[PDB]
Amino acid sequence: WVTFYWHWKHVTIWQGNAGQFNESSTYIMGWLRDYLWLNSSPLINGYNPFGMNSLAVWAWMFLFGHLIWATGFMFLISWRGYWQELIETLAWAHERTPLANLVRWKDKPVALSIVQARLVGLIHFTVGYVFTYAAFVIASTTGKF
Amino acid sequence: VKRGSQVRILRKESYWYQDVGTVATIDTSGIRYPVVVRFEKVSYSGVNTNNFSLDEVVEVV
Amino acid sequence: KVSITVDKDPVATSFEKWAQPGHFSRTLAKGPKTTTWIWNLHADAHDFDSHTSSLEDISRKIFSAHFGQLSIIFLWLSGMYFHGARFSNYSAWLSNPTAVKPSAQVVWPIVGQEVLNGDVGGGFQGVQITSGFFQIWRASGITSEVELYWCALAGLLMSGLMIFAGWFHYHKAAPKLEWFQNAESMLNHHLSGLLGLGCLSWAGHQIHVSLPINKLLDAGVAPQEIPLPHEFLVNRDLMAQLYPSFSKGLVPFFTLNWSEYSDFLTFKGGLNPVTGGLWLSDTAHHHLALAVLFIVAGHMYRTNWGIGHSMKEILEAHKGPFTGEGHKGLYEVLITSWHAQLSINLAMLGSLSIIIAHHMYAMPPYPYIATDYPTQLSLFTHHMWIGGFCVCGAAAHAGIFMVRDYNPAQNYNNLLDRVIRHRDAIISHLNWICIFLGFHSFGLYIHNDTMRALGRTQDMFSDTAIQLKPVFAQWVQNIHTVAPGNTTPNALATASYAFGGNVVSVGNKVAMMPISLGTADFMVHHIHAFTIHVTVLILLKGVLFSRNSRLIPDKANLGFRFPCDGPGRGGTCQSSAWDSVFLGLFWMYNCISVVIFHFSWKMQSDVWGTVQADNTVTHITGGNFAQSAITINGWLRDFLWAQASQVIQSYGSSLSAYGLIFLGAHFIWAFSLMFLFSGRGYWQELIESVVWAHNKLNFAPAIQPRALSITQGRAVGLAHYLLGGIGTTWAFFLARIISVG
Amino acid sequence: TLNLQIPSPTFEGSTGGWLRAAEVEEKYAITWTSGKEQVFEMPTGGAAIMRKGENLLYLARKEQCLALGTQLKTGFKITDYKIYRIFPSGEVQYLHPKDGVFPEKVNAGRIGVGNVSHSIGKNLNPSQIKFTNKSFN
Amino acid sequence: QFVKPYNDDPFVGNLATPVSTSSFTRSFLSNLPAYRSGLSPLLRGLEIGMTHGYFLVGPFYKLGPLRNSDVALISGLFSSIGLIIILAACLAIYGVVSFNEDDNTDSLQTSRGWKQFTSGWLVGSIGGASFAYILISNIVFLQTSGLNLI
Amino acid sequence: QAALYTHHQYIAGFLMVGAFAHGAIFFVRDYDPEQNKNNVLARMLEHKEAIISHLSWVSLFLGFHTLGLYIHND
Amino acid sequence: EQWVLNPLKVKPVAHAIWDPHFGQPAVKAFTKGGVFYPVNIATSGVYHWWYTIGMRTNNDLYAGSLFLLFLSG
Numbered sequence A: 001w002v003t004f005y006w007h008w009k010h011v012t013i014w015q016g017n018a019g020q021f022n023e024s025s026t027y028i029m030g031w032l033r034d035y036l037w038l039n040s041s042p043l044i045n046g047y048n049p050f051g052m053n054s055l056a057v058w059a060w061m062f063l064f065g066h067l068i069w070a071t072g073f074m075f076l077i078s079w080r081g082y083w084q085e086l087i088e089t090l091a092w093a094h095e096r097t098p099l100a101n102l103v104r105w106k107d108k109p110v111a112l113s114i115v116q117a118r119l120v121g122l123i124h125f126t127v128g129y130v131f132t133y134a135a136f137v138i139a140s141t142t143g144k145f
Numbered sequence B: 001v002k003r004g005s006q007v008r009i010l011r012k013e014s015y016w017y018q019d020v021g022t023v024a025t026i027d028t029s030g031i032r033y034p035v036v037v038r039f040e041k042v043s044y045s046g047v048n049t050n051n052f053s054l055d056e057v058v059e060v061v
Numbered sequence C: 001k002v003s004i005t006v007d008k009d010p011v012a013t014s015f016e017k018w019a020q021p022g023h024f025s026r027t028l029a030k031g032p033k034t035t036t037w038i039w040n041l042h043a044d045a046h047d048f049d050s051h052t053s054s055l056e057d058i059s060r061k062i063f064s065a066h067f068g069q070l071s072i073i074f075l076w077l078s079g080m081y082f083h084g085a086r087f088s089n090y091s092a093w094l095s096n097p098t099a100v101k102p103s104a105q106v107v108w109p110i111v112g113q114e115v116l117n118g119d120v121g122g123g124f125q126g127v128q129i130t131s132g133f134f135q136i137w138r139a140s141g142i143t144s145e146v147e148l149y150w151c152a153l154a155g156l157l158m159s160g161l162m163i164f165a166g167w168f169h170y171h172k173a174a175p176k177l178e179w180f181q182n183a184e185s186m187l188n189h190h191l192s193g194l195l196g197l198g199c200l201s202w203a204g205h206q207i208h209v210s211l212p213i214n215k216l217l218d219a220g221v222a223p224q225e226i227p228l229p230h231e232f233l234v235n236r237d238l239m240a241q242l243y244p245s246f247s248k249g250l251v252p253f254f255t256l257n258w259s260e261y262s263d264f265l266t267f268k269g270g271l272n273p274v275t276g277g278l279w280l281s282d283t284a285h286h287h288l289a290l291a292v293l294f295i296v297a298g299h300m301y302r303t304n305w306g307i308g309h310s311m312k313e314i315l316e317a318h319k320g321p322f323t324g325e326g327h328k329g330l331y332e333v334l335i336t337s338w339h340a341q342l343s344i345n346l347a348m349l350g351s352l353s354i355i356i357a358h359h360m361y362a363m364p365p366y367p368y369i370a371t372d373y374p375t376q377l378s379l380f381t382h383h384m385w386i387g388g389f390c391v392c393g394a395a396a397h398a399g400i401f402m403v404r405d406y407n408p409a410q411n412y413n414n415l416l417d418r419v420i421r422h423r424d425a426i427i428s429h430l431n432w433i434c435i436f437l438g439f440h441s442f443g444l445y446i447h448n449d450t451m452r453a454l455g456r457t458q459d460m461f462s463d464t465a466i467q468l469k470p471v472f473a474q475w476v477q478n479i480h481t482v483a484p485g486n487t488t489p490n491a492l493a494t495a496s497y498a499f500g501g502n503v504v505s506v507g508n509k510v511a512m513m514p515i516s517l518g519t520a521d522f523m524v525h526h527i528h529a530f531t532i533h534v535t536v537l538i539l540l541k542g543v544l545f546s547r548n549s550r551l552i553p554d555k556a557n558l559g560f561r562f563p564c565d566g567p568g569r570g571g572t573c574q575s576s577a578w579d580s581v582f583l584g585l586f587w588m589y590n591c592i593s594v595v596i597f598h599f600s601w602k603m604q605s606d607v608w609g610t611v612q613a614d615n616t617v618t619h620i621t622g623g624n625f626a627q628s629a630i631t632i633n634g635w636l637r638d639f640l641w642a643q644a645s646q647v648i649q650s651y652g653s654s655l656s657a658y659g660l661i662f663l664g665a666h667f668i669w670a671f672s673l674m675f676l677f678s679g680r681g682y683w684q685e686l687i688e689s690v691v692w693a694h695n696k697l698n699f700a701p702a703i704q705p706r707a708l709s710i711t712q713g714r715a716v717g718l719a720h721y722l723l724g725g726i727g728t729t730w731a732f733f734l735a736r737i738i739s740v741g
Numbered sequence D: 001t002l003n004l005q006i007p008s009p010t011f012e013g014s015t016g017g018w019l020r021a022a023e024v025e026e027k028y029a030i031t032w033t034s035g036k037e038q039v040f041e042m043p044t045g046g047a048a049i050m051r052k053g054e055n056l057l058y059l060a061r062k063e064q065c066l067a068l069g070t071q072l073k074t075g076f077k078i079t080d081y082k083i084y085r086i087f088p089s090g091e092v093q094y095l096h097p098k099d100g101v102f103p104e105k106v107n108a109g110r111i112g113v114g115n116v117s118h119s120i121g122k123n124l125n126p127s128q129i130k131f132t133n134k135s136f137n
Numbered sequence E: 001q002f003v004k005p006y007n008d009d010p011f012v013g014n015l016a017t018p019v020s021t022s023s024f025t026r027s028f029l030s031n032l033p034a035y036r037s038g039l040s041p042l043l044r045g046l047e048i049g050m051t052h053g054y055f056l057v058g059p060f061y062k063l064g065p066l067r068n069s070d071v072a073l074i075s076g077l078f079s080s081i082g083l084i085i086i087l088a089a090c091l092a093i094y095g096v097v098s099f100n101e102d103d104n105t106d107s108l109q110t111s112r113g114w115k116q117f118t119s120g121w122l123v124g125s126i127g128g129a130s131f132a133y134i135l136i137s138n139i140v141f142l143q144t145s146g147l148n149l150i
Numbered sequence F: 001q002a003a004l005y006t007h008h009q010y011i012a013g014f015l016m017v018g019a020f021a022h023g024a025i026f027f028v029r030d031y032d033p034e035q036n037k038n039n040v041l042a043r044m045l046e047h048k049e050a051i052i053s054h055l056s057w058v059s060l061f062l063g064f065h066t067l068g069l070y071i072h073n074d
Numbered sequence G: 001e002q003w004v005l006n007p008l009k010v011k012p013v014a015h016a017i018w019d020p021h022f023g024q025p026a027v028k029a030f031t032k033g034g035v036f037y038p039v040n041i042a043t044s045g046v047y048h049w050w051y052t053i054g055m056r057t058n059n060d061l062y063a064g065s066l067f068l069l070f071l072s073g
């Protein structure tokens, strides 16, 4: 919230249309339309079917952040017992498969712990958060000015 | 304290700490926690009764 | 013997139990010591199998609940018909269907919400509707608000009849378990009577009412000038003008001279050039043939007269060397468990809903529905969602059967037992195939995104680069295009113009044109496969491991819906079939969202559009799907960012409601994550602090406040997640399509 | 002691049985007498037929063995089920009915392990047992 | 009838099925190098690597970054060699970590046996990749996948 | 400028979360009630319920009314 | 050195890019610094910071890096 506020206010001032913030900041559709949707254009056009520019890296990292964020959703919504009962079947399959039972694990493959899963999901969520916004802020500022 | 008396709990770990219950029985055999207190408020585990010692209960007025 | 036996006055109608919530349950009838009691009341309201051990009681409750549901549905239909009769622009739409937007809802002018009464057309301003009721009525031959009023009256009368029947068959004449356990008789009657006579009556209605009225409407006659259906019924000469074979009568029918009816019973195929829908003269023949088929099918089972089959004999006779006893015990399982039947019926109903969505878009069945793009999109996505939910419910009730009504004694070395005895092979192989599909379907999109970002556009998986052509789908499309005259000799046109052919245009707008499949279509189809397979993995894994597993050998004792089995064994969270349904519902949402997005973009980019005087069609998006749908950036920019403009710029318009619902659905979706990412201990401790605050003021509820159970927290999170996501897509789709059509 | 010649409950096979870890680390066994040939549910998955007389069954986990025992005790009325643990060396040990009587009822001879002489509220704090060998008890 | 307990053991985590215990399956598995009798771990590795480094050159040759270049085949061989080295390293670390130095007489489940297996696999893989490179460079039908006959 | 501001604000939030986490860790591990007999720290623990309940009330206050004004404007 | 002349016109480059995955289009797209090789443009403000401090030549920055290596040691 803090950085959204800072960035939108300063972007509007830099382009000289501070009235846009003054008028659209009062409802959430204003933020969704005149700040996110409006300023994501150069970033999402970093690469396109018709070419690419230097912002392509930031577009790729934007999508990267979305991906890792949604991946963290996995660890945060899905909990251990399901994965443990699935890894059991996987271990059975490996032990029972010819030409791959010649190889065996030295550490029993188990599911992640409860606290471990919370931490991994939190880390994925945080990395997505930070990388998505870093891309957005740098690419939109560089494409607008 | 005697049977059918209101007693406030003084056990810190108790769901009814500093809360009032009714003494249902006091066993004089010599067990660790003789008094038995009933409560109207159920605990998280769903039990409305417990066994307390004489030093963990104070009669109310 | 298939016979009727009922108990008279089993339950006395009285309000005594209306004032005793939880009466149905022994643990709940005591009273609410905590707030968990309130939630349990609703979670266990309709779990009749946990109220009593009496199959007769459960079956009677289910019968009456079905009657109540039918009354509710009839009330719904009567309301829709009444709104069409009183609060709609149906007559104006009949006059000019291609210019006035259908509308049957009006809002009151209270807080400025009157803006939602947009200029739909026909001198009428209301809320544009996307349910297709106007086209249903036009196909039915309705041309007045009087007929719609009579339809609403019939719906209300049927709702009353259904509610009375439910009360009567619970409290006055409740059938017995021997009455309920008549699978042969029930299937005979459903197939023959319900379905066969329903489609026979509908064929008669189409032959006597819909066909001539729609013939005149397509001829351009005014709805006021068209005669009335009883005029058509009693004036065989008037009908013999439009369809000259009614002068012949029913002698051709009874002499098997059926070709005499080719004028109104034909196999034309294609789409009506004027309306853009299917030929009602084809639908009449379709329903007549279905009536014959169903009435014949309903004579297969033995009831009272020796002739017929016994499903027990059939099932027990169907066994082989890989299956041991085969289908033995399944007849008993299915006539003793309502949950097994519910699972089968829900799976079939959901699959049917999905099939219906696909067909009803490619073969627009109603007059003027194909060029009503909002109606088409809305119906497709709606029925897709219903299908997904029904499939997930089928998984849930399969798990419930496995936990509750599964008995190993009665299932020994049959198919069910053998499945449970090699569940590990099934789940391991499905795991591998899910991983393989995920890789070779999504890593392809990732490869394309990275190559387009690196400037190696010649290394992508695109039609202009490395190609992944769905040659099999294109081959099937070619077959269906060339079938008319060759493999369906007596059909004039293809079943759907989506396979190929000429564009069908109504009102200078595409109704249905060929849909071309390329690399992007190959990719999206394999992603559909991936998502369906993963959902199946979750649901089937839960169902198969409902009773026991290497982790929890005694899980049926814990039940179908339990939170966990503790932090031991490493952690046993979400190890129940209920939690499998929960995760599989998340994944069904994923699958259906991708499916409906694929439909929306593909249809707006390669089917829908306006046709110029040059015969060339310009589409809503204009071919952006072929070269943009191959990259996640393409989907994010050319579909979501590009098409969200209509909904985010809807303030001040009649779609401002769609904008507001867009934002509110976002709110609910985010609000779900509080329940999904969190646990019960934190909220119970926060409630402890709040209760201290309340006690400091010498008051607190007698019903002690408790945080939601673990299962209930998961359920609330999932419900809010699904509502928010589906509502966001709802607002987005409706705003976009009502703005650009 | 355990007799390795007791027949087995004529199971048809499953993929939920024991694996290489049973041959390498530990393999549990359960023996019980049945008055007739009933159908019971394997803790691993599937149905099996117990024989009239003694029945021996091999599992990978003590929890599986005890779940089967609980099923026999509650569903059926068999309570002579004994549980053993077998190592690759052939060191079959005896576990359930440890003293010949189920743990749910007191028996003379047992010694209390893990019993504490106060309530949980009297536990010490980690600050008090920090950098020391004291126990929070 | 066709599906039965594994090795007549009803309680082992396996089932005897046509795919798992048929005559064709047993013959094929028992005649593969990983199971054939008499082969040294080195010869097993030789055969397996020969077989694997052959198929590796094609995917790299026909879909690699330099596939539309005149150095596509050499690039492919080179990338196969790199992957073979990586997999040989994997085999070596797996051998040193999993198998302790006790001597079980080269049974492929020993330190010495696995060392011989990985050495043979490396040699055979590099040799097979080179053989495939030679054949592709010299035969047009393989460079065009048959599109020379068109 | 935008990159620097976002950078330092995110670092600030991480550091604040860590400060509170390590305060909790101190309470779990290093707190000696007998040593902190009725000083400011023991008093914080004494009226933790008041602190938490009033913090919850102010959170609900702010949330309810800020979100309500935003929705009204929307 | 060419940024300290027209700091309001020249974009400050952080470091060169050497990625064997870049195509010619990407190499060209990232040669925006007038340096004749693909580069990243710094967003950390170290250029402005050092210019204010008193750094003018690349030798000053190199000596600073040498000193900081010595201090790490």
Ligand code: CLA
Pocket (backbone or CB within 6 Å): A123, A127, F014, F015, F017, F018, F019, F021, F025
């Ligand atoms: C300088 C300050 C400082 C110091 C000295 C410590 C010291 C300590 N903290 Mg930490 N802590 C800090 C700041 C600090 N903390 C901050 C700012 C936070 C808030 C985020 C925390 C939150 C915190 C918690 C919640 C806990 C600790 C714990 C601990 C102790 C154990 C550390 C441990 O487990 O290592 C962890 C070792 C690691 C290698 C960390 C792995 C995860 C990190 C975050 C990497 C993830 C990023 C990923 C790699 C990037 C991917 C990039 C992408 C492009 C691919 C230790 C005394 C733990 C403890 O013992 O408590 C009793 C504990 O439970 N700390």
Ligand code: CLA
Pocket (backbone or CB within 6 Å): C077, C131, C132, C133, C135, C136, C349, C352, C353, C356, C366, C369, C379, C382, C386
């Ligand atoms: C609660 C869920 C729900 C809701 C709200 C709706 C809502 C709607 N459906 Mg329905 N629908 C649902 C579930 C639902 N459907 C399911 C589960 C199915 C699959 C069986 C269908 C199948 C379906 C069809 C085939 C059609 C609709 C249509 C409609 C629309 C018009 C309503 C109407 O009166 O149509 C009245 C419906 C008809 C005139 C068509 C009836 C033809 C079917 C084949 C009859 C089947 C009856 C039979 C007894 C069902 C059991 C079959 C089983 C034994 C195999 C409306 C948007 C119609 C539409 O889109 O119109 C534009 C439409 O044609 N729906």
Ligand code: CLA
Pocket (backbone or CB within 6 Å): C042, C043, C044, C045, C046, C047, C048, C342, C346, C389, C390, C391, C392, C393, C394, C396, C400, C560, C561, C578, C581, C585, C719, C723
């Ligand atoms: C033919 C359809 C059908 C039928 C007859 C049943 C019947 C049953 N189901 Mg259900 N079920 C169905 C479909 C069906 N199901 C489907 C499609 C799914 C997949 C989602 C499920 C998934 C499912 C599960 C996972 C479980 C059941 C259970 C049950 C039993 C008790 C349910 C209960 O008490 O509900 C009472 C009613 C409620 C609690 C109300 C729930 C409604 C929620 C809160 C959402 C409503 C939102 C609504 C649409 C409005 C949104 C708009 C917003 C702005 C307000 C009962 C036998 C339970 C069971 O048997 O447990 C032992 C159980 O655990 N079902």
Ligand code: CLA
Pocket (backbone or CB within 6 Å): A067, A070, A071, A072, A073, A074, A075, A077, A078, A082, C430, C431, C432, C434, C435, C436, C437, C438, C439, C442, C443, C444, C446, C534, C537, C538, C583, C586, C587
């Ligand atoms: C974007 C978010 C996300 C992602 C990536 C995944 C990924 C997965 N989920 Mg899902 N899941 C999600 C959200 C997500 N989930 C959420 C929110 C939930 C909670 C409802 C779940 C709940 C859930 C369940 C309950 C299950 C899954 C399953 C799966 C697996 C499907 C098949 C597979 O392995 O595909 C593989 C493909 C991918 C993981 C895509 C990314 C990989 C790319 C294309 C390749 C990158 C590799 C790269 C070269 C590595 C280099 C490293 C280093 C050099 C830098 C997979 C691990 C199912 C499963 O495991 O069945 C097999 C399963 O049972 N998920």
Ligand code: CLA
Pocket (backbone or CB within 6 Å): C667, C670, C671, C672, C673, C674, C675, C677, C678, C682, C686, F056, F057, F059, F060, F061, F062, F063, F064, F067
């Ligand atoms: C947008 C998503 C969202 C929302 C709305 C909330 C809301 C809340 N969170 Mg947060 N939370 C979220 C996401 C969200 N959270 C996430 C993703 C997490 C990570 C797991 C958390 C984790 C979390 C924790 C750990 C805590 C909170 C707390 C709070 C409260 C903060 C005070 C406040 O704003 O009160 C104002 C209330 C609101 C903004 C919600 C009101 C919603 C509507 C507008 C009210 C009207 C309802 C309407 C009449 C219903 C009609 C529908 C019906 C017919 C079905 C509040 C209940 C704290 C708390 O409980 O403090 C008291 C707390 O301890 N949250």
Ligand SMILES: CC1=CCCC(C)(C)[C@H]1/C=C/C(C)=C/C=C/C(C)=C/C=C/C=C(C)/C=C/C=C(C)/C=C/C1=C(C)CCCC1(C)C
Pocket (backbone or CB within 6 Å): E050, E051, E052, E054, E055, E123, E124, E125, E126, E127, E128, E130, E131
């Ligand atoms: C399962 C199935 C279904 C449908 C029918 C189908 C046939 C496709 C069948 C599948 C068949 C499959 C998967 C066939 C694949 C065959 C493969 C990978 C064959 C590989 C052959 C390898 C060959 C020659 C290697 C030759 C190597 C040589 C000389 C190496 C020599 C050398 C070595 C080893 C070391 C020193 C250097 C030197 C002297 C060059």
Ligand SMILES: CC1=CCCC(C)(C)[C@H]1/C=C/C(C)=C/C=C/C(C)=C/C=C/C=C(C)/C=C/C=C(C)/C=C/C1=C(C)CCCC1(C)C
Pocket (backbone or CB within 6 Å): F016, F019, F020, F022, F023, F024, F026, F027
């Ligand atoms: C000087 C001046 C100039 C302009 C006019 C103005 C009126 C502003 C005037 C006055 C300014 C003043 C008085 C500013 C006030 C700022 C203050 C008081 C800032 C303080 C912020 C406090 C913070 C973060 C506290 C965080 C606390 C934490 C982690 C506590 C963690 C802990 C916990 C949870 C358990 C025990 C251990 C420990 C570590 C203590």
Ligand SMILES: CC1=C(C/C=C(\C)CCC[C@H](C)CCC[C@H](C)CCCC(C)C)C(=O)c2ccccc2C1=O
Pocket (backbone or CB within 6 Å): C674, C675, C676, C678, C679, C680, C683, C684, C706, C707, C708, C709, C710, C712, C713, C714
């Ligand atoms: C927020 C939250 C709570 C606290 C929320 C509670 C106790 C909900 C109580 C809400 C009131 C009583 C509902 C009535 C007010 C609503 C505004 C009206 C809508 C609800 C009805 C439609 C049922 C939990 O208890 C919990 C438990 C387990 C996992 C996650 C969570 C969780 O996320």
